[PDB]
Amino acid sequence: DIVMTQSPDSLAVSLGERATINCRSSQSVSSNNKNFLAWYQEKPGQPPKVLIYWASARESGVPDRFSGSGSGTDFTLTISGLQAEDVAVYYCQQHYRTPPTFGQGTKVEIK
Amino acid sequence: DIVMTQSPDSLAVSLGERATINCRSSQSVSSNNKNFLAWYQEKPGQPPKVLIYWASARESGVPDRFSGSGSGTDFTLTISGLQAEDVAVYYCQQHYRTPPTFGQGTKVEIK
Amino acid sequence: DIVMTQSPDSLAVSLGERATINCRSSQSVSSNNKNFLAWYQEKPGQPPKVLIYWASARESGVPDRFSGSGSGTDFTLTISGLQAEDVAVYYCQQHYRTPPTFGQGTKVEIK
Amino acid sequence: QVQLVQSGGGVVPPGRSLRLSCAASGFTFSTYGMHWVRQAPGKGLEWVAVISYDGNYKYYADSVRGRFTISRDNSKNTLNLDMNSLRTEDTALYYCAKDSQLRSLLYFDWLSQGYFDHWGQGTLVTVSS
Amino acid sequence: QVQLVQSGGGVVPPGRSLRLSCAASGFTFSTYGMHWVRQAPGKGLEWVAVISYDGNYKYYADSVRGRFTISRDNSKNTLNLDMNSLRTEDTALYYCAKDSQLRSLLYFDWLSQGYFDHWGQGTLVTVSS
Amino acid sequence: QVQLVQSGGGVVPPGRSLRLSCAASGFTFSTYGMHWVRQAPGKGLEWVAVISYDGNYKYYADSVRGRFTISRDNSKNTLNLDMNSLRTEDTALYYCAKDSQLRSLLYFDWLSQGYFDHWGQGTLVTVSS
Amino acid sequence: GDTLCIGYHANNSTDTVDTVLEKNVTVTHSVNLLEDKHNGKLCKLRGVAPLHLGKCNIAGWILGNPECESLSTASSWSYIVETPSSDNGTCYPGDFIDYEE
Amino acid sequence: GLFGAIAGFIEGGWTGMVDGWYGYHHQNEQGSGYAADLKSTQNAIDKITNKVNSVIEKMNTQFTAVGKEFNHLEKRIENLNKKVDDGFLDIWTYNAELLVLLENERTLDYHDSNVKNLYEKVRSQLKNNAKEIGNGCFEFYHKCDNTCMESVKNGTYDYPKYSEEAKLNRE
Amino acid sequence: GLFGAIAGFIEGGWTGMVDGWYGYHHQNEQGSGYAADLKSTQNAIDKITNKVNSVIEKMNTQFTAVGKEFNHLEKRIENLNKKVDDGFLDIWTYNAELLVLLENERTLDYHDSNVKNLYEKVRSQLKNNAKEIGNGCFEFYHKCDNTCMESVKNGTYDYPKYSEEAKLNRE
């Protein structure tokens, strides 16, 4: 199948700055000018909710400070002005083949 | 026209046995799983009613004991459990070209 | 640009007979069994009016005694049964390129 | 129930015309083409002529080409056959048949016509002196 | 019935603008295209411009390009023709005509129009010192 | 409002069946596919199984193939997961998810699923003696 | 070497169309079959101004409610306009049968 | 993209040309440029304007009066009128949407048809004097001035005139 | 003609062949005339008659009474009846007209496709034993007699049988 890695793992920054995590896939996932990647975020004691779908859009109810981009095999999630209530775990997920595979995951927390 | 004749004629069998009538065409008749042949039965003083249409199906009304099969250029009429009031004359038929060339005719008669 | 032209200029013609007016184009005009020509008749001090459309059809208002023909690059206009009020100026134009050029002008006048 | 009743046959000497009619009832007529087929005495059945649902196209057997004139009408639902230049060979028993393919189109003289669903009661014709 | 009546002409010195307008009645306006074509005092007719049915695509002749302006307003049933920087060869008798092709699409730079269906009476336009 | 609640989990020794039900309400259930996904303690998420809208075609991952049995009852809007042949590694936290592609068709074993819209609250399953 | 090529037109139109096989495909040229623009006016239908009764209904105009005696009559009208706030109808209470008739 | 010309074996269109829907890109020892096949795209806009007239203008309506007034004692008749309005609403939205979708697909594939048929015409001419290098571009085996550019724009290519030179040039 | 066979690379039909929608014209030392490919046009006839039957038979109308009458005291419901009849008229006219137009276009495209793939079958069965002269005609490199005609039309043409003879005349 397809495996991916998020190179920053358990990165720590304080409130207000920028947090960048990448996502490198084993093979190409994007097709016909469309990004087949989604991001997920879970807090302790809560199910992992969707954060950004199709790697550029945004689920209604997500704050505007959460944005992401990327193409081909490399994608990035960026946090504009981290808040203390956003300490959580982020996931990659390519929904291109019948075994959707989640990334190993990264943690964002206070410095 | 597509000349078409059947070999067995004037067959005579008693009640209960089998009577087979194979029928040959000089050129291929069926195409695209469309077996273009019919069998017709008439008694003396009676109009020729259809017996088997499409060479495999059954027109509603004829006894179930009358059946036929075959494909390509060989097409057979088989009578199982022949009953006394089923003595008649059987005609082949090819409706593939506009001239329907009937067989020269076969006849069944009790023994 | 395609430029129209008519050989007879200010031709003098009397009552009752035929006044032919040809029309030569720089290149081909018609395509897909459609003649792309229109004739225009106007009296002095009067607005122009569409006269013959597609070089072969007649309109409502134009007299039956007057018609026209042509195919390809040479199109002709025929004056059959000339009345005195037919003194006018006749014009060619090809509506095959975005500039429809008009002919330099031909005139009919009572001999 | 389909019914193909027909009458008009009889005795005739060679060299004069004869009119036949096969009325139809019990089903919609103008959608099904109809067929002609005959039974020579002591012989087997053989082909005569066909006409489409609309009557626009009219096809003939090779044997009786140019002598038999087929027509149909849909107002009274009758299939009629005209007789020109008869010979003693034409003596037979006439059967009016119905084609099976609904609204069958016959635009060329060899196409695959349908089989015969229903057959007429039969009319007797003799060409003798 | 169709009517193409226009006004707005007169005497204009060179270098100053002039506006012409012809309103239409008796037929549906937004579907058909519209044209302008001019007749010099003694020379003859020659094409000016054309506008599409929706007014999105505006097309010009090879002579008055960069100086004229074609516009239309389907709500007021009114065609218009603005002008910049006239010269001495603009004396003519301005005609606005209709297009025979219904809902024609004038997409590219050489497409074929229809025969000019019906015509206006013509308003006098001249330029002089 | 989309809601996904599931229950029936707990502790189980290896070798006995366990059945889970994820009831759904507040949205059109029968027109969307569903998924199974699990969270191994101390590890990341991984896929389990998928069922399409009509329930004809089902798929599983490479780790639980031939042991699980995903099933669905659209008459009760209830997703089910028959779960047999346990081992110690199978302990995780099970979620039921909904696909994003409306009325998606799954006909082969490599197609592109949609992203997971909404998730269940999660129930604990563990394998211990 | 000399090289000819075969291609097709391309521009920067942002107009998009939806087909059966695919959705949101950009196209160079289009026409919109559905118009969603209304002028916000009650134009004269068939060249005739509507019989705008203002603050009165059909009962007010036809029966002669004094609150709308000011509005004049017309030789013809195409359709009748009533405001939603038109309450000045049958001032004396009663049943004006076949009113909608 | 059924017939496979647009978005198929053609990578993409040329934005540098505006003259026609179905254009060329000539290039010879003098230089290059853009042009358009007049006949093909003239035919294309003609047929498509016919499509537009046959869709819009054909919608045949005469005078209608939709709104109806009813009192509280005629609720059944008003409900029947509401059902009628909803039924024609449903029919018209369904047919309108499906019909416009089908027309969109047919028009896109007609464009694909014109591009592919033009490609097949230029392949029918020039039968063995050009290498089909791909993406719709022919690499000519013989140097010829704009008589051959305009000639393949124009339907009058002369194969035997350059056939022997092409045979000599191929190794 | 989306596929581009009729009025495409074939300039026009043949008026002297009333024996099938699709045919071959062949000349050689001992035979010349027009004859039809029986199977292809027979399949076309069957498909087209099924198409016409599908268009016509889907009328399933029960016994209806369109005519309705109402006196002066219920002019409203008479207007409602007129509204219903007018709406049915409008939807039937629009749907039927555009259905007929689309079906006619599809039928013409079907016939075009049959011509195109008949030509495709012939060229595939013939390979390079003949030169594509154009106009959908073939010029053989070898003596191809009446049984060679039957081999080409029936579908049992042989490649290696005439390969050496064709290579003899190709240099």
Added chain:
Amino acid sequence: GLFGAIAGFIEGGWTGMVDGWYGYHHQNEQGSGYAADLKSTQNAIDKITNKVNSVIEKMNTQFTAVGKEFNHLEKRIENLNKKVDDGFLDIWTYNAELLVLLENERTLDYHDSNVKNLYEKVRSQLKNNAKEIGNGCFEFYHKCDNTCMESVKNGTYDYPKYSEEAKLNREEIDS
């Protein structure tokens, strides 16, 4: 089919492959087996699911109560309601039936188009290096080792590198 690739120049389908609608069956000196193409049939699945979504969901329907009741003195309005419902029945039956039949033909034509486009892609990609032996099969004029199947199946086959040996072996074949 209208393209001659479903029961056309390719006669019968393959039951041997399971991993997609459009695929390949290849054999060489080192191995064999079916190898389904990915991108073309993935796009096919996407367009077909959009097609069925458009056919099903574009018909929107609101709440209604088509059941009406009338008494004995008002048979006319009852018959009017019956006519309205019956006319809706005929409109819906015909529009639905013709939609189903036309879309059936359309999607079969789509599948035929896709398989023919795949064949045309492989034919243009390989060209003179392979011999079309009919029934959608190419016989190489050389012995291609690996990445040849893979590059054919994803449209990135390197032509000129194999061309030298292809034409060298070609001379043995066509004199």
Added chain:
Amino acid sequence: CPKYVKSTKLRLATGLRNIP
């Protein structure tokens, strides 16, 4: 006047597939 539809967009395509 035309018939009312609750649809949002009916754009009948006329041009190519816009691929710059």
